[PDB]
Amino acid sequence: MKPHPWFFGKIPRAKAEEMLSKQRHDGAFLIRESESAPGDFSLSVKFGNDVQHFKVLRDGAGKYFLWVVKFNSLNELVDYHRSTSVSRNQQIFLRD
C-alpha cells in the first residue's frame, strides 16, 4: 500500500494543528493518512482557536466517508460541508 502523498502524507497531528494555528483561518482543515490504519484518513479542522479531529473512513467500495452524510467522494462532502456547517451544535465548516 503506497502511502498517499496528498496534503502532508503521514503528517503528525502535532504539526497539522500547529500550522492551522498559524493560518488563523476558521473553517480550515488538514487531511492526512494514518500509519496505524493505512488507507484511512483523519480530518483536522481549524474551528475558532482550536482544532477538532474527524475520522475519514474507507468503505467497501474503495470510497471514503466521514459523516452520516455521504457523497461520491471525500472531496465532495467536505465541499458540501464547506458551504454548510457539519453540525447544528458545533458550528464548524471545512474550508480549503
Q: How far apart are CA 56 and CA 26, in angstroms?
A: 20
34 within 8 A of 42, measured Cβ to Cβ: yes
Identify the experimental approach: NMR
Give how many domains the chain has, as a whole number: 1
Domain around 22: 1-96
For cell 479531529, the residue is: 53
Q: How far apart are CA 44 and CA 31, in angstroms?
A: 6
DSSP per residue, the chain: -PPP-STTTT--HHHHHHHHHHHT-TTEEEEEE-SSSTT-EEEEEEETTEEEEEEEEE-TTS-EE-SSS--SSHHHHHHHHHHS-S-SSS----B-
17 within 8 A of 25, measured Cβ to Cβ: no
39 within 8 A of 62, measured Cβ to Cβ: no
